[PDB]
């Protein structure tokens with residue numbers, strides 16, 4: 599042939615939703631042969647013309663994306679390549695928000711998307727606290743500090759050194775140093791221990807919000823530009839409850855499978871069982887309402903204020919999903 603197979607035709611039709619909140623990312627995983635991260639990253643890179651802008655050879659991009667996707671664990675229910683693909687596509691939609699039109703450079707866009715793609719790579723499906731309490735090698739390497747997030751970054755960068763994997767081979771030293779610092783700042787901000795400070799700084803920025811004549815956000819210094827990118831990827835990472843309920847419930851099934859598996863490993867070893875990890879002493883519905891009330895709603899309400907009114911339908915879906923879970927509390 600020279601034209602797509604029939605499976606490739608159906609995948610290409612699903613990928614027409616790539617600019618929309620609520621992409622059927624599970625269907626894209628099935629149709630791509632478990633390559634959601636590769637096909638979604640490729641589609642986004644083509645759509646945003648990043649291959650031409652950064653002179654990325656297409657074979658090098660595909661080789662790196664497949665290598666990165668392979669270092670996500672297929673046996674981990676939540677922190678896998680589908681979650682990476684989801685956070686990439688969600689970051690992509692947030693970057694296109696009208697309140698941010700023409701705010702970010704091509705290099706900052708590349709940073710936010712690359713950061714999203716690598717942000718959980720080689721996740722073992724247990725928490726930082728589990729790795730610290732078991733005296734894992736990873737906890738020792740990173741001195742018990744943002745252990746997983748340090749590891750995600752180190753693997754994401756290290757994989758650029760595999761055969762035909764250096765997608766940044768044509769960037770100048772100045773571009774690579776700036777890209778690298780922004781990617782590190784974004785992924786380290788995905789550690790939930792940083793959530794409260796990130797949210798305080800986003801709130802401060804909403805109170806002192808400056809807008810251009812075009813009605814778009816004004817971000818002068820690096821500190822403000824990087825805080826917005828950090829909160830954007832953090833929002834993408836915490837975007838599950840803002841999705842149509844059929845998607846949210848698949849994410850909830852997956853995180854609860856992963857948490858219960860950690861709880862089984864803790865109970866086996868006689869360790870204290872972590873919050874929400876005890877399959878015998880769990881209230882999935884109550885936990886989701888608490889997650890939304892204390893973490894997700896305060897973050898997304900502050901984001902919605904920053905980009906008012908672009909996020910109103912996302913905030914509405916979140917409040918609808920919150921009432922659905924509340925209404926199922928036994």
Ligand SMILES: COc1ccc(CCOc2cc(C3=NN(C4CCCCCC4)C(=O)C3(C)C)ccc2OC)cc1
Pocket residue numbers: 790835836838839849850853874885886888889892893
């Ligand atoms: C305030 O009461 C809460 C009540 C419930 C929860 C989590 C239950 O749901 C989900 C949780 C997560 C995550 N939970 N956390 C951490 C949250 C912060 C405190 C430590 C526990 C783990 C993560 O690092 C990620 C982002 C992977 C993702 C997707 C979920 O549903 C689709 C959290 C808090």
Ligand SMILES: [Mg+2]
Pocket residue numbers: 717718746788789
């Ligand atoms: Mg993470």
Ligand SMILES: [Zn+2]
Pocket residue numbers: 681685717718788835
């Ligand atoms: Zn994540």
